Amino acid sequence: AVIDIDAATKIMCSNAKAISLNEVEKNEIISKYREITAKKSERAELKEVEPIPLDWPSDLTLPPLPESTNDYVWAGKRKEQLIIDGLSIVIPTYNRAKILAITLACLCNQKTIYDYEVIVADDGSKENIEEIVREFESLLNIKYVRQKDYGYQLCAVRNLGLRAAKYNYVAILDCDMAPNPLWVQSYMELLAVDDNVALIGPRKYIDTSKHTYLDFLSQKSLINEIPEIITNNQVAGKVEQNKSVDWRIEHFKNTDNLRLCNTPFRFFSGGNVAFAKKWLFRAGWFDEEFTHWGGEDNEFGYRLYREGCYFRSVEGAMAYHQEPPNITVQLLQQKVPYFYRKKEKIESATLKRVPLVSIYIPAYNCSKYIVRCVESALNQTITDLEVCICDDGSTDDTLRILQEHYANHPRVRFISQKNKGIGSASNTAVRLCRGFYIGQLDSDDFLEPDAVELCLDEFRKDLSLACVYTTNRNIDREGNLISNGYNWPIYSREKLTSAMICHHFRMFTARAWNLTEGFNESISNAVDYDMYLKLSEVGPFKHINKICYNRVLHSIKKLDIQKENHFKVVNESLSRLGIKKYKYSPLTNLNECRKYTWEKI
Amino acid sequence: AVIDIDAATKIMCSNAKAISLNEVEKNEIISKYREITAKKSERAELKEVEPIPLDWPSDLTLPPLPESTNDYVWAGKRKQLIIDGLSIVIPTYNRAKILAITLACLCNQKTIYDYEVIVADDGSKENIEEIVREFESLLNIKYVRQKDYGYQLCAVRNLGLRAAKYNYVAILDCDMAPNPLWVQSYMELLAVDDNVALIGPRKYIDTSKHTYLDFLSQKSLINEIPEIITNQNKSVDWRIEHFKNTDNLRLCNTPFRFFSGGNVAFAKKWLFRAGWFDEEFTHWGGEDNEFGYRLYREGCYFRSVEGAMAYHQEPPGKLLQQKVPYFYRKKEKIESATLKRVPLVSIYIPAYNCSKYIVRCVESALNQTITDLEVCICDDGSTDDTLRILQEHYANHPRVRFISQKNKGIGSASNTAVRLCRGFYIGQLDSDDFLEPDAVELCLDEFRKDLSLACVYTTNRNIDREGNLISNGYNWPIYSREKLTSAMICHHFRMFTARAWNLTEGFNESISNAVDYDMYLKLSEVGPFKHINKICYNRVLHNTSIKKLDIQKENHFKVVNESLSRLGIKKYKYSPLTNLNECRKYTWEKI
Ligand SMILES: CC(=O)N[C@H]1[C@@H](OP(=O)(O)OP(=O)(O)OC[C@H]2O[C@@H](n3ccc(=O)[nH]c3=O)[C@H](O)[C@@H]2O)O[C@H](CO)[C@H](O)[C@@H]1O
Ligand SMILES: CC(=O)N[C@H]1[C@@H](OP(=O)(O)OP(=O)(O)OC[C@H]2O[C@@H](n3ccc(=O)[nH]c3=O)[C@H](O)[C@@H]2O)O[C@H](CO)[C@H](O)[C@@H]1O
Ligand SMILES: O=c1ccn([C@@H]2O[C@H](COP(=O)(O)OP(=O)(O)O)[C@@H](O)[C@H]2O)c(=O)[nH]1
Ligand SMILES: O=c1ccn([C@@H]2O[C@H](COP(=O)(O)OP(=O)(O)O)[C@@H](O)[C@H]2O)c(=O)[nH]1
Ligand SMILES: [Mn+2]
Ligand SMILES: [Mn+2]
Ligand SMILES: [Mn+2]
Ligand SMILES: [Mn+2]
């Protein structure tokens, strides 16, 4: 032999090539994998303690957490000016002019206080769409965008309009989705209060066939009067017809309009939605790689979620789908890791467009202990992950080593930058990660073969979890054991705002991270505590009591005053919670002391 | 019952009003101003020195400044982008036959970069869609349309630019038939340096005799057709004469004057940075010229390309002053003065607990020999009432604008105050200090005398927190970059070009002190400085600094210099010649 890349990854690339590597080889490598990721994290010393420090004030109560990952009421509380100009409404159209007409009519009948433009988006229609639009030029503040015919390009056309949209609030409407008179108002009135929430309107099905667009401009309510169509469903051999309905509405009333749902994107359907345009630049636009089978909605909604955008249902946004003359799970799979992606076995397992996990690593001068650091994650029971490193202007071979090692690794990705400190390094690396579950791994340390896996099981139990940390063992730079890391048994916010109990190896929901101000780039240290204190405000944490992190154990007078300094700021900075009646002051005037006192002000 | 604002402004807010003020009420106000501003800055002590620090390494030569504010070659040297392609927004209004010919010419483009054609239709009566729809199987053509609500050129240009999907855009009046090497000539340059906007030359020709089809088969006809006389010996792009003297503008200092939305190409990033086209316009110009100005102010460069020739087809039987002070603005007197929309000058004041000395500050800016000036104050999360003072003082002032943010250092307040300013000439004014009534004028003069000039600065005399004049401020007789890179010789009052600033990284929001020395150092690289040897600044002198902080002060200092490691200097390090903390003596260690 000589040198190489992990077997974990080796197998996936093999399972990929349509030309089967000889079983004899494949097996030999799989085994080598199985044995290198065989050890199991060893549980830790079972302790016993005071959940919420007694010293903790009995008049102080941190702002209650959110009741789910999409709880927008709680998001509303989070205090923290905007321009409420108008609502650019994009209507994707492929022929059906006589219908776009009706939809344009029901858009003339809008009783709202907001300015709204209608952007008819034509994706290479055959019928003459511009003819229609011109007819309305005298009623709506209408615009027309067109792209040539090159297939089914809804995502592409959706993008044109949204691009053409001039306001800060966009809305999307299939050309067959006739809004009700209160559509604009309903969306806008909510987008004006919270712009971090993507309103989703419901729908009903109507056979608008017996009418022309004139009937609607006339009867400015006719749209709410036309009977919902009926469906001839086949139930076990014999026919059963019922009133076709929006399958989502049932779910809407059972989640308080998705305020409690932990997977709102499952209901996001671009045929009638509204949101702040800023999100397009944050989570991207509709994926044009999607064919007519769909998935683009969920996949888009997912990325909205992964950034921190919320989801909400509006009844005032009811749209009417005009009657046109199964296995979605296999469509997301690749681009939506979170809820949908299920584990494959190394044998049949294969690389993923978007990894389920992203191990970020801030690296500065971690010369020799960095190739050990990266393989400690590439060699994990969870094969569906990636490693993103950020060279913080190392003054040593670090970066050079990363290249002659990972410059072509399908599962590793780095980025160099001029040294800006540890707070930054991270932001840069985290931003590099494309996965939903994100863990921390410093340069000189290294993990345990099932660290990531162990955390992953905890996220799956409570999809409300924002973070999950394990415990660690203090290690010799050389690699020798010399202690077991501090391990506070149970997690609670109070204990956190009293002492840094988030032992190392941490894992957080990218969405949760995005709901935070990110890493603090102006402090020499206390970076971890800050980030994780910030996280505690976003959601609950879960601690596993096993040793999954091997940490190297690596104080000149003046310095110290900084450390003490930083530590207390962090807790104070947590004024974010709108807490001003107290203050976490030191109790002593010593450097290495951490004893604190809740002095009132 | 009496109590109000200030003079100069008072008048301006009048000369504007539509009710003739009793010349009496007025007059006195005018004397107020005159005597309140009739003072002039006394010359500064005369010193004799040696221009370049005699310690300057012979083998150290500072990278040469640009030859003109728009020297894109220099810019080029200084120092992965996604070169997706070109988005060509073609503003259309009928002339459907001409469009067809133009589109036909874009079909014959010989280039390697990918491109798209967005037809921006501003209320055409004719069937533009038909023409677009015709060129579908030849061009990636998108077609956008807005209703006829008048002459909305800018409007439509923006609609299209918004619809652009690539990182590079281009505009071409519906009748501007591009030459075969157009798209290429632009991308070629755009891919190497996206901080320079490309201006294309034109030619007027007769097109009626043809049909868009001719140009499709005769891929080389638009070049053979004869120039005519549009409404010498024929009609010629007046700009072309200038394009060959200024070395394609590389030497021009008012490049925004040759900017046409009929034939240009630039990095879309600019729309997002200098603003889009100003829809507040009517039937003619100003836009091309005003948008270009803004670009200019945001550090953009203008370079006329030749290969981007375009042919202006002949039609069938068919304002600025407010927003542009750098060139056109005319220093007009007070009694007939006014409030210009876009100001010519802006004064930024980082504020932090200056409650006791702030009104005295802001005021002085207004009470200047200059009328077209503004003040942009940024309260850096003051603890005291600073903010309230400002509020109930200028919360309505038609020449003052302020803002609040949690205290984050001086390097931040600046980057925020300056980022707030709207004028072209920016001057620094510290809260507790106060300027002389003619300092914005003096500086303003020097700038008039030279446009290569990036910054002009005077000198000052120190003051007692209260007002008692203490000692006269330091003064280096003559400027030079080599000197500033050896010790802060850039005294206080300091005015620099908005553009200059924009060519820099702004203030350092990470250093307790030296910020000042870091900006004018960052600036000294972008352009030349002029030094007015007259006292125009009165700065308070606040006392006792305990050793510890004095330990970082000297630290920052040196860092600032070295930090000017952007000049690509790798062999020298500006180190100390003493471990003492308040010492500033240096040595050039050859590394
Ligand atoms: C009520 C509902 O479940 N609506 C969704 C459903 O559409 P539907 O299954 O209701 O079919 P549909 O034809 O109404 O959806 C087509 C929508 O896409 C447009 N179109 C169609 C063909 C074309 O070549 N270009 C084009 O832009 C057309 O303008 C219309 O707005 O499934 C789609 C999957 O893509 C979208 O997620 C729709 O929002
Ligand atoms: C190459 C050139 O010399 N261009 C400038 C010159 O054009 P011209 O004097 O040649 O004016 P023009 O008749 O070519 O019209 C200018 C452009 O505006 C468009 N248009 C016209 C009327 C309308 O209601 N909507 C509309 O979009 C039209 O398609 C054309 O693209 O002077 C104008 C003053 O405003 C513009 O600065 C043009 O950029
Ligand atoms: O300017 C820096 C300094 C440190 N680090 C990294 O931040 C982590 C923590 O710092 P270090 O090991 O030096 O001490 P630690 O902070 O680990 O206790 C390690 O990844 C360092 O490699 C960094 O990215 N940039
Ligand atoms: O946290 C601060 C501290 C000061 N300043 C402003 O910084 C400028 C210079 O501050 P300082 O007084 O320290 O500078 P000096 O007056 O000492 O030159 C003054 O206008 C202050 O009002 C600020 O914006 N933020
Ligand atoms: Mn449909
Ligand atoms: Mn370490
Ligand atoms: Mn013209
Ligand atoms: Mn001061």
3-state SS of A98-109 is HHHHHHHHCCCC
> Where do runs of H (alpha helix) occur along B330-438?
358-366, 386-394, 410-417
Q: How far apart are CA B431 and CA B363, in angstroms?
A: 11
Which residues on neighbouring strands pair with residue B175, listed in sequence order?
A: none
A295/A309 Cα distance (integer angstroms): 19
Residues in chain B: 591
- CA proximity to A216, closest of A96, A120, A97, A103: A103
Structure-token pair, residue A387: 């490693």
Q: Which of B429, B430, B513 to mutate to test the pocket of ligand 4 (most atoms within 8 A of CB)?
A: B430
Strand-pairing partners, residue A546, are: A43
Which amino acid makes up residue A238? Answer: K
Question: Do A372 and A405 meet the contact criterion of CB atoms below 8 Å apart?
Answer: no
The span from the CA of B204 to the CA of B232, in Å, is 12
CA distance A596 to A582: 13
| Known binding residues of B for Mn(2+) | 175, 312, 432, 542
* Any A CB within 8 A of B508 CB: no
Write the residue with the smallest CA distance to atom 4 of ligand 1.
A271
- Does B566 contact chain A (CB < 8 Å)? no
Q: Say which residues have a Cβ less than 8 Å from residue A580's Cβ, sequence separation at least 6.
A: A601
Decide if A145 touches B, using CB distance below 8 A.
yes
Q: Whose CA is nearest to atom 22 of ligand 4?
A: B351
Q: Does residue A270 have its Cβ closer than 6 Å to ligand 1?
A: yes
Q: Which domains does chain A have, with CATH numbers?
A: 1-66+328-601 (3.90.550.10), 67-327 (3.90.550.10)
B263 CA: nearest ligand 2 atom:
1
Q: How many CB atoms lie within 10 A of CB A215?
A: 15
CA distance A563 to A593: 11
Return the structure tokens found at B61. Answer: 């030569």
Shortest distance, CA A145 to any CA of chain B (angstroms):
4
Name the pairing type of β-strands A506-509 and A437-440: antiparallel
The token duo for A461 is 């139990």
Chain mean position to CA A6: 29
Which is it for strands B425-428 and B345-351: parallel, antiparallel or unpaired? parallel
Rounded-to-integer distance, Cα A540 and Cα A262, Å: 14
Q: For B464, which DSSP code?
A: -
Count the neighbouring beta carbons within 10 Å of the beta carbon of residue A111: 11
Q: Give per-residue burial for B487-500: e unless 16+ CB within 10 Å, then b.
A: ebbbbbbbbbbbbb
Backbone phi and psi for residue B213, each to the nearest 5 degrees, phi listed first: -60, -45
| B409 → chain A, closest CA residue | A522
Interface membership of A130 toward B (CB under 8 Å): yes
Q: Which atom of ligand 4 is nearest to the CA of B539?
A: 16
> Which ligand 4 atom is at minimum distance from the Cα of B430?
20
Distance, CA of B539 to chain centre? 29
| Listed residue (B341, B408, B339, B393) closest to B362, CA to CA | B393
Nearest to B457 by CA among B429, B495, B486: B495
DSSP assignment letter at B137: G
Residue of B129, B136, B142 with shortest CB distance to A160: B142
* Other C-beta atoms lying within 10 Å of the C-beta of residue A545: 17
Contact state of B144 with A165 under an 8 Å Cβ cutoff: no
The answer to whether the CB of A310 falls within 8 A of the CB of A70 is yes
Whether residue A163 and residue B163 make contact (CB cut-off 8 A), yes or no, is yes
Ligand nearest to the backbone CA of A269? 1
Pick from B141, B145, B162: which is nearest to A144 by CB?
B145
Report resolution in angstroms. 3.0
**Is there a contact between A143 and B142 if contact means CB atoms under 8 Å apart?**
no
Q: Could you tell me if the CB of A299 is within 6 A of ligand 1?
A: no
Angle in degrees, CA A325, A326, A332, rounded to 5? 110
Query: Could you tell me which residues of B are annotated as the binding site for UDP-alpha-D-glucuronate?
Result: 352, 380, 428-431, 492, 514-515
Going by the annotation, the residues of the binding site of B are 91, 95, 122, 151, 157, 173-175, 287-288, 312, 352, 380, 428-432, 492, 514-515, 542
Backbone angles phi, psi at A534, to 5 degrees: -60, -40
Whole-number Å distance between alpha carbons of A219 and A228 = 18
How far, CA to CA in Å, does B259 sit from each of A43, A316, B256, B287?
Answer: 71, 48, 5, 9
Chosen for mutation from B129, B508, B510, B563 (greatest number of chain A CBs closer than 10 Å) is B129
